[PDB]
Design an enzyme around this catalytic site. Sequence first.
Site, short mmCIF file in Angstrom:
data_model
loop_
_atom_site.label_atom_id
_atom_site.label_comp_id
_atom_site.label_asym_id
_atom_site.label_seq_id
_atom_site.Cartn_x
_atom_site.Cartn_y
_atom_site.Cartn_z
N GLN A 159 0.87 -1.20 0.00
CA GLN A 159 0.00 0.00 0.00
C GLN A 159 0.87 1.21 0.00
O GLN A 159 0.82 2.00 -0.93
CB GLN A 159 -1.05 0.04 1.14
CG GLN A 159 -1.78 -1.25 1.39
CD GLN A 159 -3.05 -1.07 2.13
OE1 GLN A 159 -3.78 -0.12 1.92
NE2 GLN A 159 -3.35 -2.01 2.99
N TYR A 168 6.86 -9.45 15.52
CA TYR A 168 6.25 -8.31 14.77
C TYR A 168 6.70 -6.94 15.22
O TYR A 168 6.76 -6.63 16.44
CB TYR A 168 4.73 -8.33 14.93
CG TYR A 168 3.98 -9.33 14.07
CD1 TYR A 168 4.60 -10.48 13.53
CD2 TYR A 168 2.66 -9.14 13.80
CE1 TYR A 168 3.88 -11.39 12.74
CE2 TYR A 168 1.91 -10.01 13.02
CZ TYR A 168 2.52 -11.15 12.47
OH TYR A 168 1.80 -11.99 11.61
N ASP A 191 1.09 -0.73 8.59
CA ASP A 191 -0.20 -0.35 9.24
C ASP A 191 -0.38 1.16 9.06
O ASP A 191 -0.06 1.65 7.99
CB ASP A 191 -0.26 -0.87 10.63
CG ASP A 191 -0.31 -2.40 10.68
OD1 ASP A 191 -0.78 -3.09 9.71
OD2 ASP A 191 0.26 -2.96 11.65
N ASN A 238 -1.57 -10.93 -1.47
CA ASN A 238 -2.50 -11.50 -0.52
C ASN A 238 -3.86 -11.70 -1.21
O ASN A 238 -4.33 -10.80 -1.91
CB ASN A 238 -2.70 -10.58 0.65
CG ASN A 238 -3.20 -11.28 1.87
OD1 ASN A 238 -3.67 -12.44 1.87
ND2 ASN A 238 -3.16 -10.53 2.99
N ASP A 280 -4.75 -14.68 4.76
CA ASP A 280 -5.09 -14.19 6.13
C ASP A 280 -6.25 -13.25 6.08
O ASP A 280 -6.41 -12.46 5.11
CB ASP A 280 -3.88 -13.45 6.84
CG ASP A 280 -3.42 -12.22 6.10
OD1 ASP A 280 -3.04 -12.33 4.91
OD2 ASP A 280 -3.40 -11.07 6.68
N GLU A 281 -7.09 -13.34 7.11
CA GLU A 281 -8.04 -12.25 7.48
C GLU A 281 -9.01 -11.98 6.37
O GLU A 281 -9.47 -10.84 6.21
CB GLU A 281 -7.32 -10.94 7.90
CG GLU A 281 -6.58 -11.04 9.21
CD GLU A 281 -5.99 -9.77 9.70
OE1 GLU A 281 -5.72 -8.78 8.92
OE2 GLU A 281 -5.83 -9.74 10.94
N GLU A 321 5.64 -8.80 0.41
CA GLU A 321 4.34 -8.41 -0.07
C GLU A 321 4.47 -7.04 -0.69
O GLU A 321 4.79 -6.06 -0.04
CB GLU A 321 3.33 -8.48 1.05
CG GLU A 321 1.90 -8.33 0.52
CD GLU A 321 0.82 -8.19 1.58
OE1 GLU A 321 -0.33 -7.75 1.18
OE2 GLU A 321 1.06 -8.43 2.77
C1 LIG Z 1 0.00 -12.28 8.80
C2 LIG Z 1 -0.53 -10.97 9.29
O1 LIG Z 1 -0.40 -10.78 10.65
N1 LIG Z 1 -1.83 -10.67 8.74
C3 LIG Z 1 -2.73 -9.88 9.51
C4 LIG Z 1 -2.17 -8.51 9.91
C5 LIG Z 1 -1.40 -7.69 8.89
O2 LIG Z 1 -2.22 -7.45 7.78
C6 LIG Z 1 -1.60 -6.93 6.63
O3 LIG Z 1 -1.63 -5.50 6.61
C7 LIG Z 1 -0.83 -4.99 5.52
C8 LIG Z 1 -0.84 -3.48 5.65
O4 LIG Z 1 -0.18 -3.06 6.89
C9 LIG Z 1 -1.38 -5.57 4.18
O5 LIG Z 1 -2.67 -4.96 3.93
C10 LIG Z 1 -1.49 -7.09 4.17
O6 LIG Z 1 -2.25 -7.64 3.04
C11 LIG Z 1 -2.19 -7.61 5.40
O7 LIG Z 1 -1.94 -9.03 5.45
C12 LIG Z 1 -1.03 -6.49 9.73
O8 LIG Z 1 -0.02 -5.65 9.23
C13 LIG Z 1 -0.47 -7.23 10.94
C14 LIG Z 1 -0.44 -6.46 12.23
O9 LIG Z 1 -1.09 -5.20 12.17
C15 LIG Z 1 -1.30 -7.32 13.15
C16 LIG Z 1 -2.06 -8.39 12.34
N2 LIG Z 1 -1.30 -8.51 11.07
#
Ligand SMILES: CC(=O)NC[C@@H]1[C@@H](O[C@@H]2O[C@H](CO)[C@H](O)[C@H](O)[C@H]2O)[C@H](O)[C@H]2[C@@H](O)CCN21
Length: 633
Positions: free
Chosen positions: A161, A390, A438, A230, A291-292, A187
């Site tokens: 992003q 993280y 983030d 993703n 994820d998510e 990514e």
């Molecule tokens: C594996 C990961 O922890 N996935 C869940 C999230 C992350 O989500 C990502 O956010 C980035 C932008 O910052 C992209 O949009 C990406 O596609 C997403 O997977 C997030 O960055 C991170 C932490 O904030 C806590 C949870 N994970």
Amino acid sequence: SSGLVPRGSHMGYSATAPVNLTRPATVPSMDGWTDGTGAWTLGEGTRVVSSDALAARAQSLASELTKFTDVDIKAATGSATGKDISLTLDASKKAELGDEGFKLNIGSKGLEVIGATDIGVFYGTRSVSQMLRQGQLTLPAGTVATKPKYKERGATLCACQINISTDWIDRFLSDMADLRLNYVLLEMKLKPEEDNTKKAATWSYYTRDDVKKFVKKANNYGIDVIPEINSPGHMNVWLENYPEYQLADNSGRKDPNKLDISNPEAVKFYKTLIDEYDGVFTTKYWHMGADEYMIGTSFDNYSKLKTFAEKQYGAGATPNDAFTGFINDIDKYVKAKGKQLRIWNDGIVNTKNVSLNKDIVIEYWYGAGRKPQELVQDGYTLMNATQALYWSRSAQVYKVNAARLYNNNWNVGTFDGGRQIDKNYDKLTGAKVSIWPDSSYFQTENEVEKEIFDGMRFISQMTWSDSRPWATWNDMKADIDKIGYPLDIREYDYTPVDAGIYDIPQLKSISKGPWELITTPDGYYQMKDTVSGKCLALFTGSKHLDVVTQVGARPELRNCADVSVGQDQRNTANERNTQKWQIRADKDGKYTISPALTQQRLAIATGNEQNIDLETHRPAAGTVAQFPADLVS
Ligand SMILES: CC(=O)NC[C@@H]1[C@@H](O[C@@H]2O[C@H](CO)[C@H](O)[C@H](O)[C@H]2O)[C@H](O)[C@H]2[C@@H](O)CCN21
């Protein structure tokens, strides 16, 4: 008087050495050092000697060591003397050293580095560089052989992003190599150029030329650069301009983050992207995320996926089955291209009609849901991607605490939430830290670089050596600081121009100037207009992650923020960091000005720049605006 004078040892080997002369530390540690008699001194006339094949490695090491030591160190072929560093590739030593390990012998034949592969020799040279760059040019004699415990050691770098500058990535890759880290999950968006995907060429993106270049640098360093796009969640940066592929909920509301996996043209769009990436990354892996997908909601709000599941995978099939079926179909697709698939673990859901393919690598970050020990029993291949490793620019819950992990006995089998598995599990690939943007204005990429230092050394140590030879974290920290950054980071010209008063013709649409430039601790500039007394900011425009990503956004004058403060000043972060500017010198001589947060480049708009954003808003021609570097070179 004391008579204090430098010892000034002769170059080469000496049978005499004090018994407790310091062995300079490395990271990773090289455990099981066997002490020999005497010591070896790098000095005038020392050469790096190798075969022709290793010439490039020898020349690079000589050049680096000349810079760190102030001694003219040349590379050579033929016979080595005790004055010399010798590089040897012996592929017959695979049992002892593996694909990445190395042996050092320090003694009357000089400093010998032996590896069973090119990367092995290179990794031995990293230890040599670390040992010689700490102000000590005499090394205790002896021998050690070392190889990494785990095969994959590295970082997730979400260049997603927002854009992480190619210069930052190059420095990152040099730091990883120093630390013997061989894995980066990147990514990122590779700029889509085909008629059917080009509306997703919004910023951040990377050009094919730029990726080819950092992949080539990575590969020379033994680093596998694995791309991630993703899916089927977190797809905003891809589907914003393709609402036809977005998943609608029961009321018909579409989410740009969600791919409609029941729409075969949406799945084909994803596969098209895989095919675009295939030309520029060299890796044998594909990471699809997974994820998510349903974050902020639930599959009950998407009955259409249930319907799809039942058609596709038979009566009783559930949305979880459809989701797993999409993963399995992408697995089938990338296998047929010679790749192995990788996902995040929260992609592993309770299924009924479909079962997840076991040939998919599971990178485990989320300890709620199917537990590590359960996946072990199942036979899955696992990488530890714990949340304990993280960082986030904005989510202060996510700041690696290397002290705590070192002191509490974490190891690579310590999965998310402190759930231990056998660290010798034969399908445990390794572990990684993860670097997430983030909400991205809270920290500049240069502040990220400063913050991750300790954690990068921690993961290096625990994935290669899996040992704690320092009695405490504080003892480790003192040695990692003495070791310092590799050469490329020390050489990077963060602030190529002096602070002072400048004429800047590119900015005349904003002010005739002149401009007062001052430097910041994170290696940027603030630019004050001497006419208005206000400072230049990239502040306004459409955003992702609270950073202006809009191609053609214009800068503006705003009241001067205090750029001298650190990242703990969160309350003023946006005004501050929107006023930071990166200045780079051309090859050669000319300077470009980039917003530190956005990493686009200021340019005078011609009206001929072509990009999806510019189809719906253009800055007035002849005014100064930001553009990706590829539209203005
Ligand atoms: C594996 C990961 O922890 N996935 C869940 C999230 C992350 O989500 C990502 O956010 C980035 C932008 O910052 C992209 O949009 C990406 O596609 C997403 O997977 C997030 O960055 C991170 C932490 O904030 C806590 C949870 N994970």
